[PDB]
């Protein structure tokens, strides 16, 4: 019943603001409906938004890179990589690698999200970083699963 | 003297250059990639008092590589139980540049994790590995 829409709800659940929620929702939905979209425009826009924590930008950046055709432009942006590089925390990095290996064996959104839902926001974000480094390591659905668990954990944290 | 070979090690990777570390202040812009993080990591050991974490935190990442991160964390644990220069450097030598670099990012965030000597070993082991 549409994973894109589920992913959007999870993404928006970590966007504080109110005005940004609407702005993010519009962009995700345009992307979903194939409407006029351009990845460089989205990223630049995302990068310059106020209020959104670096982490949220990393997550939205990852989701746009995953959902936006507009590639053939070997992406990998600084702000996305930095916000998802973990943060010098050994424990989150160790867990991120362990989750990452489990996700490579998953093939569905549901299986990926359930496994990832037990991990901490920190390791989930580091894990998103590993996958950002090579989006093909897992399937799109699995990547979506991970994004959603990450959002749940950030939302449930504070 | 330890700051001597560390200084040559620190300049073991540099691309003409102009030394900068003689033994406070700030940045250094213009060019210089990963080395920037390394150098910065160095300064953070030879410039503050008895903060920032600019491009230090970014260059000393694991570059989205699963194996480097994996290794970097296992090295990190070891370098914590280590206590001398050469020893830490010895061990760090059995790991790759990527791993070594990722290990430096960890140490950074919590410098107090490893002694200045050990960290220096990591540095040299890293540069030696890099330059090589």
Author numbering:
A (entry chain A): 1 to 158
B (entry chain B): 2 to 16, 20 to 27, 45 to 71, 75 to 156
The article reads:
In the present study, we report a unique low-pH crystal structure of the M1 N1-165-domain of A/WSN/33 (H1N1) that shows a significant rotation (44–48°) of one of the monomers, resulting in a distinguishing dimer arrangement from previously reported low-pH M1 structures (vide infra). We have crystallized the truncated N1–165-domain of M1 using low salt and low pH (∼4.7) conditions in the space group P21 with unit-cell parameters a = 54.30, b = 37.35, c = 94.97 Å and β = 102.4°, and one dimer (monomers A and B) per asymmetric unit. Monomers A and B are related by a non-crystallographic 2-fold (perpendicular to H6) symmetry to form a dimer; placing the monomers in a face-to-face fashion that brings the two basic faces adjacent to each. The dimerization is maintained primarily by hydrophobic interactions between the symmetry-related helices H6 and to a lesser extent between helices H9 and loops L9, augmented by hydrogen-bond interactions involving Asn82, Arg101 and Asn133 of monomer A to Asn82, Asp94 and Gly88 of Monomer B. Monomer B shows significant disorder at the N-terminal domain containing residues 1–81 (H1–H5), and as a result residues 1, 17-19, 28–44, 72–74 could not be modelled. Figure 1 (D and E) shows analogous electron density maps of monomers A and B that illustrate a typical disorder in monomer B. Even the N-terminal domain residues that were included in the model show significantly higher than average B-factors of 92 Å2 compared to 67 Å2 for the C-terminal domain residues 82–156; similarly, the average B-factor for the entire B-chain was 78 Å2 compared to 38 Å2 for the entire A-chain. Importantly, helices H1–H5 seem to have unwound, with H2, H3 and H5 becoming unstructured. No other M1 structure shows such an extensive disorder, although residues 69-77 are known to be weak or disordered in other M1 structures. Although the unwinding of the N-terminal domain has not led to exposure of the H1 and H4 hydrophobic residues, this observation for the first time may indicate beginning of a domain rotation that exposes these residues as proposed by Sha & Luo.
The matrix protein 1 (M1) of the influenza A virus is a 252-amino acid protein, comprised of an N-terminal domain (165 amino acids; N1–165-domain) and a C-terminal domain (87 amino acids; C166–252-domain), and plays an essential role in structural integrity, replication and budding of the virus. In the mature virion, M1 stabilizes the two major viral surface glycoproteins hemagglutinin (HA) and neuraminidase (NA) by forming a matrix layer underneath the lipid bilayer of the viral envelope. M1 also directly interacts with viral ribonucleoprotein (vRNP) consisting of viral RNA (vRNA), RNA polymerases and RNA-binding nucleoprotein (NP) and mediates the import of vRNP for vRNA synthesis in the nucleus of infected cells.
